[PDB]
């Protein structure tokens, strides 16, 4: 009863702390621990919602209890789920886990603009980046031109996450960087569901295989190929070519 509870999400992140009398993750010393089991946001939570989490490192666990060291600076984070019109209350405050793992630079893919790259070598199944954005409906997205739908990502059957211009510029939005991954029919990453303590229910980019430092991260965009394909022209072209090599 003076013990510690760990609750893992399927994505591998967890909440950890002493639960209250009702069995809720509520207290001043609750933590969210990212999937590396090392990076943590440690502080005040109410029923598992982050009110004020300070950046920390999980240094060891003893008898199941985590022991944290706070990182320098006064890096604090709070639950801040996007709405249909607001992407983030701190658009320029990077996610600390993501910022150690990826960076944005010119893509190696011809004519594809910027892309997402690994900062370090990592193994398979590694969460690399987070896909956050404004939350709009499939009806809104499907009713408008492809020119407006470059950055849209389906979250589930009710919600599409979008990063509307000009938040597609890293100088205007860099809280998450997952929208920067380019498409490949032979990708090294996939989208997966992710429950984030700041962003809420979103998607992440996870590696399929080991990746080297400075390797471009790509995902299969997964547009419907036989509703020709409902897709931008650059994708339709690439699809034909891909089918050829097959």
């Amino acid at each position: 009863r003076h013990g510690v509870c760990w609750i893992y999400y399927p994505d591998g992140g967890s909440l950890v702390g002493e639960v209250n009398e009702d069995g809720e993750m509520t207290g001043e010393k609750i933590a969210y621990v990212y999937p590396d089991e090392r990076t943590a946001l440690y502080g005040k939570f109410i029923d598992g919602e982050m009110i004020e989490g300070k950046l920390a490192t999980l240094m060891s666990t003893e008898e199941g209890r985590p022991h944290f060291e706070l990182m320098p600076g006064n890096s604090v984070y709070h639950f801040d789920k996007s709405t249909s019109s607001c992407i983030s209350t701190n658009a320029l405050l990077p996610d600390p886990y993501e910022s150690e793992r990826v960076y944005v630079a010119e893509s190696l893919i011809s004519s594809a603009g910027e892309g997402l790259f690994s900062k370090v070598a990592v193994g398979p199944n590694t969460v690399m980046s987070f896909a956050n954005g404004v939350r709009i409906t499939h009806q809104e997205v499907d009713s408008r031109d492809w020119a407006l739908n470059g950055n849209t990502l389906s979250l589930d059957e009710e919600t599409v996450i979008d990063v509307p211009e000009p938040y597609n510029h890293v100088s205007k939005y860099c809280a998450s960087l997952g929208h920067k991954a380019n498409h490949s029919f032979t990708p090294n990453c996939i989208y997966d569901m992710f429950v984030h303590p700041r962003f809420g229910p979103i998607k992440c980019i996870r590696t399929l295989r080991a990746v080297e430092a400075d390797e471009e991260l790509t995902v299969a965009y997964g547009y419907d190929h036989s509703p020709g394909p409902e897709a931008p022209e650059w994708y339709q072209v690439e699809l034909k070519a891909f089918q050829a090599t097959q």
């Binding site: 499939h138 499907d142 849209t152 990502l153 389906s154 998607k203 965009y221 997964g222």
Partner: peptide, 8 residues
């Protein structure tokens, strides 16, 4: 759908 990664 005009979005990535929809389950069809």
């Amino acid at each position: 759908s005009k979005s990535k990664d929809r389950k069809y």
